Amino acid sequence: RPNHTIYINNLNEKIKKDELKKSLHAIFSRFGQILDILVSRSLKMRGQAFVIFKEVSSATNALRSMQGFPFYDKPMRIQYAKTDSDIIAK
RNA sequence: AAGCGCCAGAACU
RNA sequence: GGCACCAUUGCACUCCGGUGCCAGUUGACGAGAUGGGGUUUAUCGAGAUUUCGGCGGAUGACUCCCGGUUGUUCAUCACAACCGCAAGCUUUUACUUAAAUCAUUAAGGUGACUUAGUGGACAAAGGUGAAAGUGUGAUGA
Numbered sequence A: 001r002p003n004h005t006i007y008i009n010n011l012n013e014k015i016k017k018d019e020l021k022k023s024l025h026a027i028f029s030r031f032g033q034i035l036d037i038l039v040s041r042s043l044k045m046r047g048q049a050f051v052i053f054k055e056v057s058s059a060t061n062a063l064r065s066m067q068g069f070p071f072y073d074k075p076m077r078i079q080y081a082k083t084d085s086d087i088i089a090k
Numbered sequence B: 001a002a003g004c005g006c007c008a009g010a011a012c013u
Numbered sequence C: 001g002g003c004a005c006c007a008u009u010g011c012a013c014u015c016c017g018g019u020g021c022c023a024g025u026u027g028a029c030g031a032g033a034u035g036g037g038g039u040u041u042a043u044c045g046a047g048a049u050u051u052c053g054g055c056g057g058a059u060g061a062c063u064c065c066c067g068g069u070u071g072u073u074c075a076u077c078a079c080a081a082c083c084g085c086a087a088g089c090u091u092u093u094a095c096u097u098a099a100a101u102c103a104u105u106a107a108g109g110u111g112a113c114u115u116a117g118u119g120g121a122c123a124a125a126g127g128u129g130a131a132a133g134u135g136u137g138a139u140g141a
């Protein structure tokens, strides 16, 4: 079902880790306070992000509102995290 | 203040 | 680390697909050492290392000079070795001669790395005094 962490994909792979990590924070900061955004660039983890909210309330609203939103010329695909994240789980 | 200087090899980011 | 091109729609949380091409970073730790000219592969140890490879320089070495020291107390030549404030050869002997490494803890940088402090060290080539044996002939005052 729902989760503190939201899984975003279909992100522009041409954008560098830190720029993407900050450009994400710009738009998701209104829904609630973000604990950490996790972005890698490997073959397995590129075009994806892990915006973690302290509140699931924020995660639900962010999912509803930002679904399909144009981000670097590419529409976002937002799900919930399949499993909890460590800064929540621990 | 001369085992001292710079850097298309090469290792490393 | 970054651009590009191929490949990838991918649920991760100690970094990490392939191909090129550009940027960056590392690249000698101190001791030692300059009369002039030419020549050549330029002294010494420390360090587990790239202190590798290339280029340049260089106070080294050889060798011909310029001066000087010393050669049976003085000079001027021969001849021999020597010195460029320091000066004939050999030997035994005594004293003198660092900084990195390290280990630390601070700054900076995505980054490999950088610059700086603290801790105690640990050399060799040299250098110094001491002895011991010793080093031409010709001519002149």
Ligand SMILES: N[C@@H]1[C@@H](O)[C@H](O)[C@@H](COP(=O)(O)O)O[C@@H]1O
Binding pocket: B003, C042, C058
């Ligand atoms: N003092 C050193 C010398 O001992 C060394 O011969 C020379 C050449 O160095 P390299 O052999 O790295 O070219 O450099 C310096 O001058």
Ligand SMILES: [Mg+2]
Binding pocket: none
């Ligand atoms: Mg490869």
Ligand SMILES: [Mg+2]
Binding pocket: none
């Ligand atoms: Mg070299």
